Each structure stands twice: as structure tokens, then as C-alpha cells.
C-alpha atoms as a printed R data frame, in Angstrom:
   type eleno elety resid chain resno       x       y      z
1  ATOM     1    CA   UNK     A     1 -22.139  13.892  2.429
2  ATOM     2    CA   UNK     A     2 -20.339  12.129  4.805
3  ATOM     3    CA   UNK     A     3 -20.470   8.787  3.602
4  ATOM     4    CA   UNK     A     4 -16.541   8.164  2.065
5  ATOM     5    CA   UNK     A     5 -15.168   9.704  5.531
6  ATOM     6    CA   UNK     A     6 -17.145   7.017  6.830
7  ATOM     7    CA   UNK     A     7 -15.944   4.329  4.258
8  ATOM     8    CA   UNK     A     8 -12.481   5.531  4.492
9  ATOM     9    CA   UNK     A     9 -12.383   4.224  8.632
10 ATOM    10    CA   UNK     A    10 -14.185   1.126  8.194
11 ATOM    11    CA   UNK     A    11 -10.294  -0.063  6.522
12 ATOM    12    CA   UNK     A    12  -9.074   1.011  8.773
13 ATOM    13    CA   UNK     A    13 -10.861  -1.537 11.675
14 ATOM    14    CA   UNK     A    14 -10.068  -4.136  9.724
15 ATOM    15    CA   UNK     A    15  -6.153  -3.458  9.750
16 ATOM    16    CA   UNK     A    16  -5.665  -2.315 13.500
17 ATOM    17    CA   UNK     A    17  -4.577  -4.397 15.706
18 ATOM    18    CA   UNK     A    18  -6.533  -4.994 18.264
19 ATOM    19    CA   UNK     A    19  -9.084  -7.294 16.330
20 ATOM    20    CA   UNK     A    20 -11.117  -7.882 18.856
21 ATOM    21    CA   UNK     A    21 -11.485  -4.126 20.316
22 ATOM    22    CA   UNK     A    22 -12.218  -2.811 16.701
23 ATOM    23    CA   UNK     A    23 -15.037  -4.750 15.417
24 ATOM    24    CA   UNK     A    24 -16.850  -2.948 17.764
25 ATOM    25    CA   UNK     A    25 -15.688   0.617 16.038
26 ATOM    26    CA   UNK     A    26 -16.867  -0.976 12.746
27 ATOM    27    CA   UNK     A    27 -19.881  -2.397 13.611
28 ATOM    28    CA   UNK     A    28 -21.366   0.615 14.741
29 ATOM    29    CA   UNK     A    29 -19.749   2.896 11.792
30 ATOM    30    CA   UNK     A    30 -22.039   0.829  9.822
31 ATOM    31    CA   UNK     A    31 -24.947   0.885 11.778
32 ATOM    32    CA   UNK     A    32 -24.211   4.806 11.539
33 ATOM    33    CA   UNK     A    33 -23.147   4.701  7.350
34 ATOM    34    CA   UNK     A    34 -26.701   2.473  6.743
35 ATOM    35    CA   UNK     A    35 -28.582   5.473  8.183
36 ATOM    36    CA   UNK     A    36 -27.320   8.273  6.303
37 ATOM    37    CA   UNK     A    37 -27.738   7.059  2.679
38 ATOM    38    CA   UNK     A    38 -31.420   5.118  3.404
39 ATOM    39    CA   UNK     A    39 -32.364   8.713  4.695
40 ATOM    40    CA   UNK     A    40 -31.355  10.337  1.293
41 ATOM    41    CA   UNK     A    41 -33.371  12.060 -1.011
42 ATOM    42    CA   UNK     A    42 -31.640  14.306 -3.925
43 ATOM    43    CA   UNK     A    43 -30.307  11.878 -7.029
44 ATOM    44    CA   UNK     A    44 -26.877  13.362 -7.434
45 ATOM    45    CA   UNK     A    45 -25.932  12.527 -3.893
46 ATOM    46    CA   UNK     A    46 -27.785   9.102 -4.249
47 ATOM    47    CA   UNK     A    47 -24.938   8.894 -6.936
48 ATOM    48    CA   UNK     A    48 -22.512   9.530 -4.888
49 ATOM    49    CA   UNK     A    49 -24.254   6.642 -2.099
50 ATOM    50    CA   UNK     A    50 -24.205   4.347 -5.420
51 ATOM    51    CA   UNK     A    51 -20.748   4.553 -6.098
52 ATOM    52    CA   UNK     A    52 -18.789   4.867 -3.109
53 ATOM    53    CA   UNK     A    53 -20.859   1.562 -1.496
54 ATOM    54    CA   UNK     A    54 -20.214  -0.409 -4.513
55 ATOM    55    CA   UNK     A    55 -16.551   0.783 -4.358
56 ATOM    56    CA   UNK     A    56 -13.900  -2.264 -6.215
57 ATOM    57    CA   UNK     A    57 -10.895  -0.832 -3.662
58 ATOM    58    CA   UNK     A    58 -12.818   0.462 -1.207
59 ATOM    59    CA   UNK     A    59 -16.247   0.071 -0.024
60 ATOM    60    CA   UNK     A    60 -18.685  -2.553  1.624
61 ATOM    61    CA   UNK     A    61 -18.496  -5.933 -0.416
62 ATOM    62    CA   UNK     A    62 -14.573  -5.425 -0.323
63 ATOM    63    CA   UNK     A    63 -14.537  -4.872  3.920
64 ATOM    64    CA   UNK     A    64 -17.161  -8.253  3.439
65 ATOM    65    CA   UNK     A    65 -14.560 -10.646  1.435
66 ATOM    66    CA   UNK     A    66 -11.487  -9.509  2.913
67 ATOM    67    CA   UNK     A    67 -12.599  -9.640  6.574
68 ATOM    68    CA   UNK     A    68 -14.232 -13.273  5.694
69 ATOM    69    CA   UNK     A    69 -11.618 -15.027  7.919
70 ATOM    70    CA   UNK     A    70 -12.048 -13.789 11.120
71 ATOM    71    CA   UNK     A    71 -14.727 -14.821 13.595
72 ATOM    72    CA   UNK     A    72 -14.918 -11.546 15.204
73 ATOM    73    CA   UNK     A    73 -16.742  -9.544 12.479
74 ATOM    74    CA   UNK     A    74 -19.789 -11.495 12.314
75 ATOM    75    CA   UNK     A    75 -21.855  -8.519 14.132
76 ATOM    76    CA   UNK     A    76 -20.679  -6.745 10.967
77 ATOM    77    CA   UNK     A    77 -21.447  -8.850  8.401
78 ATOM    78    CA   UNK     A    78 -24.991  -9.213  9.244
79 ATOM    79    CA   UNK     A    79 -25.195  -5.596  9.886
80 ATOM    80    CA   UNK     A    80 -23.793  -4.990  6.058
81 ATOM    81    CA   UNK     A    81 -25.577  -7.605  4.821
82 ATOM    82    CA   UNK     A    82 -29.023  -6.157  6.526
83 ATOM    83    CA   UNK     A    83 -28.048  -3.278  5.015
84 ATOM    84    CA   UNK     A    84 -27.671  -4.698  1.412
85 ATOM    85    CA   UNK     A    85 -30.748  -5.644  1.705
């Protein structure tokens, strides 16, 4: 499972500074993330997928509210709300 490699960058976009530039590294490390745990199937690793997405430090809702600011990340929070759904 790569999915908390994957979690672990996606802070990291959203603290570099080139704002602009690394939306676009985030954006598509979703679009990558939303792949691998849709294509799942064995229910030990779909508890892993259910509790590193739902992370309270870390994770998808948290990148959501603290990015909610910026104007740049709007690509991304369609994306992760797509996702969600």
C-alpha cells in the first residue's frame, strides 16, 4: 500500500512555496491516491484506506479545511471532493 506515502506529500504542497506551481503536484497526487484505494479489494488494506483518508492530523478533510483560503486549490478540492463521493 502506497497510500500514506502518498498522504504524507500532499502536506507537503500545501506548505511549499511556490503556491501556485504546487497545486499542480497535488492535484494530480490525488487524482493518482483516488485510484489506488477505489481499485482495492482485500478488507485489511481497505482498513488501512479507511483510516489513513479519514486521518484528524493528516489526511484529506484536513488538506480540505486548511487549504480553504487560497484560490489556487480549487482543481483540488473538486478532485477530493469527487473523490468523497
Amino acid at each position: 500500500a502506497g497510500v500514506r506515502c502518498s498522504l504524507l506529500r500532499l502536506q507537503e504542497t500545501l506548505s511549499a512555496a511556490d503556491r501556485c506551481g504546487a497545486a499542480l503536484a497535488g492535484h494530480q497526487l490525488i487524482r493518482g491516491l483516488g485510484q489506488e484505494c477505489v481499485l482495492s479489494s482485500s478488507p485489511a488494506v481497505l482498513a488501512l484506506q479507511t483510516s489513513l483518508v479519514f486521518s484528524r492530523d493528516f489526511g484529506l478533510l484536513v488538506f480540505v479545511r486548511k487549504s480553504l483560503n487560497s484560490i489556487e486549490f480549487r482543481e483540488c478540492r473538486e478532485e477530493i471532493l469527487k473523490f468523497l463521493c
